[model samples]
Target: SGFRKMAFPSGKVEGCMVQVTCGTTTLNGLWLDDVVYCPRHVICTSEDMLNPNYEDLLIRKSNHNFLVQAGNVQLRVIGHSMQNCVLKLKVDTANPKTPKYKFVRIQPGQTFSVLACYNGSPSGVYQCAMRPNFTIKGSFLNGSCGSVGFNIDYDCVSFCYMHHMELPTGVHAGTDLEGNFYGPFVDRQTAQAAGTDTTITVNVLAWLYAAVINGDRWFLNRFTTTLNDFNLVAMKYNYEPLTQDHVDILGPLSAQTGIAVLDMCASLKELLQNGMNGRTILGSALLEDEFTPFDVVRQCSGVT
Candidate 1:
């Protein structure tokens, strides 16, 4: 009796493996080892689960990995200490020469993420990539993807088939990389520069910064312990003791400093036309001042 677990989808998703398959499949006494991918990991595509945003929390995280295709079954949230999930994702096509799916074992300062993902709105075919590694900095949201568009990125795609993290300097062409994966949404910087770490799901983007962080209760307990490095890269995709030859994608899904949000608008339709790009969206009084981190690189660079 294990069949419920899934949720996530604020926005972002083009294609990688975010697929799913369930709800009406009738689960069958659940058993993909208990399953958990938050927001039903992928499946509905266009049948039920209505909403499901995937990746774009700047897809952070280090060696940890989080892959949830859903219903069909591809869950890999991490090796333990998981958070609310909804696993599934397992296409066959006669195993189609197996290339995706990756995970196996976890824990080592935990690091992983991904949850409640709907990805690319309208459902079906999503994308995200940006690379970095060494269980730390050196980021840009890394690389990879096929059917592109929206935050587009592509190199040449060499495919070491993700040796479990490795390939930072001069990132090879395999979906796109060389920096520019901008924001906490570049598929964890090319899946840790090719070594392919968790793509996205650091407590599902620190629970979306614990509900859009803006200074409070000790920064959500330090962002809930920085989402254990995105659940250890979603429980280590591709499975293995992965002798990381090139690992660096670190935790709290990286990139989010001791937040104090509430600057309001700069893009995304100027935070819903709150219009603060020119400093006039004054309505909440800038949430009691103090919002460093270059004010989010001057409100995402466009800075009025």
Candidate 2:
């Protein structure tokens, strides 16, 4: 026993390019050019995080921290525009009969990058045995030290637990037209004008869409199989640092889609653009009941 292992130089566990595609689209392509057989990664399997019953647990650290195991994962988080945009991620065993985990509390303009591995836990077992199945949860940041102990949800059958990262919001977020986000339309007139000009300047919209798709694809392939779990919601600007354009967009989308962009608008247009002739660009169905016809323009945000 003098040597550990031997191999040629074709493909020795190096240079792996991971691509994720679904519904006839290549959503994302991640290149693992940094990963190498350096022996620094600790290898552990689901068996490593398992105990009797997969329940009756304990804890040694606080929340917002992570661990490493064969069945575990590492996350590289991105950022969000919402300065103090915090959230809680966990398992939802609210309906004890059927267990499930989800990501809740996410707001508009926010991005979450979760990195973890799953050792699927199946169902229908006599005793408390290892089931190759998984259940995840996402909740609004519930203040206080989150689950300081081995958090347990005895509700879901075979529902287990593990560690994740808190991730700095700045890491995964960028600016309009530059990063994964789209427009933060300065004011109403500005926002409406884009649509009225015949060509919408969705500089940030296109980029944001790309970022969302890219980010979604990455998370989709790694952790869960169901991508519908990914949800987008309206967000608020804590400092209210917005322009009229910001308000114009939010006023409409928020009410109709329930996909709020926070209350950025002060005064929105009263009328709706009839056709694609760029008339009612700012007038969304949202204001159908709230306002009447008005033709005027003056201020940080306006719609005429």
Best by TM-score: 1
Model 2 Cα displacement at 58 (Å)?
22
RMSD of 1: 20.3
lDDT score for residue 214 of model 2: 27
What tens digits encode model 2's per-residue C-alpha lDDT throughout 74-144? 32212111111111112111112222222233223222222121121111111111111111122212111
Relative to the true structure, how large is the alpha-carbon lDDT of every model?
0.25, 0.18
**Candidate 1 Cα outliers beyond 4 Å, as residue runs:** 1-12, 16-19, 23-295, 298-304
lDDT, model 1: 0.25
RMSD in Å for all candidates: 20.3, 24.1
TM-score of 2: 0.16
